[PDB]
Design a protein around this ligand. Structure first.
Ligand SMILES: *[C@@H]1O[C@H](CO)[C@@H](O[C@@H]2O[C@H](CO)[C@@H](O[C@@H]3O[C@H](CO[C@H]4O[C@H](CO[C@H]5O[C@H](CO)[C@@H](O)[C@H](O)[C@@H]5O)[C@@H](O)[C@H](O)[C@@H]4O)[C@@H](O)[C@H](O[C@H]4O[C@H](CO)[C@@H](O)[C@H](O)[C@@H]4O)[C@@H]3O)[C@H](O)[C@H]2NC(C)=O)[C@H](O)[C@H]1NC(C)=O
Ligand SMILES: *[C@@H]1O[C@H](CO)[C@@H](O[C@@H]2O[C@H](CO)[C@@H](O)[C@H](O)[C@H]2NC(C)=O)[C@H](O)[C@H]1NC(C)=O
Ligand code: NAG
Lengths: 52, 259, 52
């Protein structure tokens, strides 16, 4: 006789974990792109330093 | 953008309550007589303000838990748990009230039986039902709380009566409480409605010496993966969408909505 | 040895009256009778009173 509580606790536990899963995955892919562009900029600024 | 109209889901018509509540559907309200047939649905469509619920006044115990249990129910089989003629040889089952008028005459619930006296005596009651439907069975009853001791002695022939309803997972004893009450729908008495969900292979036992509104028809409930209760004022037409809101239906593959 | 019995369990934060309910019941583990189990958590320096 506490099904509204069981569904609410299930909603909280399956909403927080989905939000933090999305946050971790989104942070991983965004800083993967930032790393892959950061390395290209470090090679290009080295080439520009030797050119200058 | 939506249709603006209520739709069937995947070729399955919704259970439209119309003027009914969840309570008036399960109790078998005489205005809610179209819903009392063996059927399946995709969702339950209900009006935001519907008045045909419990016609006799009283407290529906754990109504919102019954709504949460019935949100995941896809179909029922309405079967006579206790027959009105066979199971009651020593009580007068022909009990109607003025709180539930059906075509301008007095009637009572189509799922419940108001037991009264027979030949000036109310005998002891012990009726057992064993679940052989292999599903969850919604058992529904009521306990009558009169307004004065004169109506209690008139109806049930004793001052002190009780109702005992014991399952394996249910154990509750009920005591009528005679008191002076405000009139709701012309009645100063109350029928308090209770419910339990029988397990497959479980036994319900109904014991009473008075004030029992016994079960007549029970609901053998079938669960489903996708179902719910939608509160909408939208009219239902012929429609075969896959997404359904209260405000209409959606036919697109777009990932988001703001309806 | 009596028709009407009671159990009264009173603490500072607990107050409940228990009445036995004799009824015809389904048999679970070979018994038609029930023992209803209750519990409470005493505070430090608190008094529990059992009356029956
Ligand atoms: C303050 O409140 C308290 C409680 O809240 C009040 O206490 C109550 O007072 C009333 C009124 O006096 C009492 O009712 C009486 O009960 C008597 C004993 O009952 C026994 O006999 C019954 C006989 O049954 C038959 O008669 C009744 C009508 O009386 C019919 O309904 C029935 O169908 C039968 O035909 C048994 O049924 C019962 O089980 C008991 O064994 C009655 O004898 C008494 O009847 C007298 O009065 C009638 C008119 O009302 C008259 O017709 C009769 O002939 C007879 O003279 C009456 O019903 C409550 O019992 C009592 N309750 C408690 C718990 O004590 C209190 O009065 C109130 N005080 C004030 C100042 O308001
Ligand atoms: C609605 O469903 C119930 C099932 O619970 C039907 O009751 C069965 O009816 C058949 C006869 O067609 C009997 O053989 C079964 O024993 C009944 N089962 C019970 C009472 O549990 C009921 O007839 C259906 N009503 C309809 C189709 O109008
Ligand atoms: C159903 O609702 C209508 C309108 O609110 C009302 O007039 C009627 O008495 C109701 N019927 C029952 C049985 O409650």
């Amino acid at each position: 006789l506490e099904k509204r509580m069981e569904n609410l606790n299930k909603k909280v536990d399956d909403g927080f974990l989905d939000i933090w899963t999305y946050n971790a995955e989104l942070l991983v892919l965004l800083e993967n792109e930032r790393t892959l562009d950061f390395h290209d900029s470090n090679v290009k600024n080295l080439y520009e330093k030797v050119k200058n | 953008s939506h249709n603006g109209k209520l739709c069937r889901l995947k070729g399955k018509a919704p259970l439209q309550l119309g003027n009914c509540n969840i309570a008036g559907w399960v109790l078998g309200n005489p205005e809610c007589e179209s819903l009392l047939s063996n059927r399946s649905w995709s969702y339950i469509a209900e009006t935001p303000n519907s008045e045909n619920g419990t016609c006799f006044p009283g407290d529906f115990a754990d109504y919102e838990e019954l709504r949460e249990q019935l949100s995941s129910v896809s179909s029922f089989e309405r079967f006579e748990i206790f027959p009105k003629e066979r199971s009651w040889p020593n009580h007068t089952t022909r009990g109607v009230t003025a709180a539930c008028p059906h075509a301008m005459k007095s009637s009572f619930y189509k799922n419940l039986v108001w037991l009264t006296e027979a030949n000036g005596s109310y005998p002891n009651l012990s009726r057992s039902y064993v679940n052989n439907q292999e599903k969850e069975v919604l058992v529904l009853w009521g306990v009558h709380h009169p307004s004065n001791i004169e109506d209690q002695r008139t109806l049930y022939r004793k001052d002190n009566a009780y109702v005992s309803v014991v399952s394996s997972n249910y154990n509750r004893r009920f005591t009528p409480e005679i008191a002076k009450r405000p009139k709701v729908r012309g009645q100063s008495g109350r029928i308090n409605y209770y419910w339990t969900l029988l397990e497959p292979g479980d036994t319900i036992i109904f014991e009473a010496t008075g004030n029992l509104i016994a079960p007549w028809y029970a609901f053998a409930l079938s669960r489903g993966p996708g179902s719910g209760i939608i509160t909408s004022n939208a009219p239902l037409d012929e429609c075969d969408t896959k997404c359904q809101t209260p405000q209409g239906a959606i036919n697109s593959s777009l990932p988001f909505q703001n309806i």
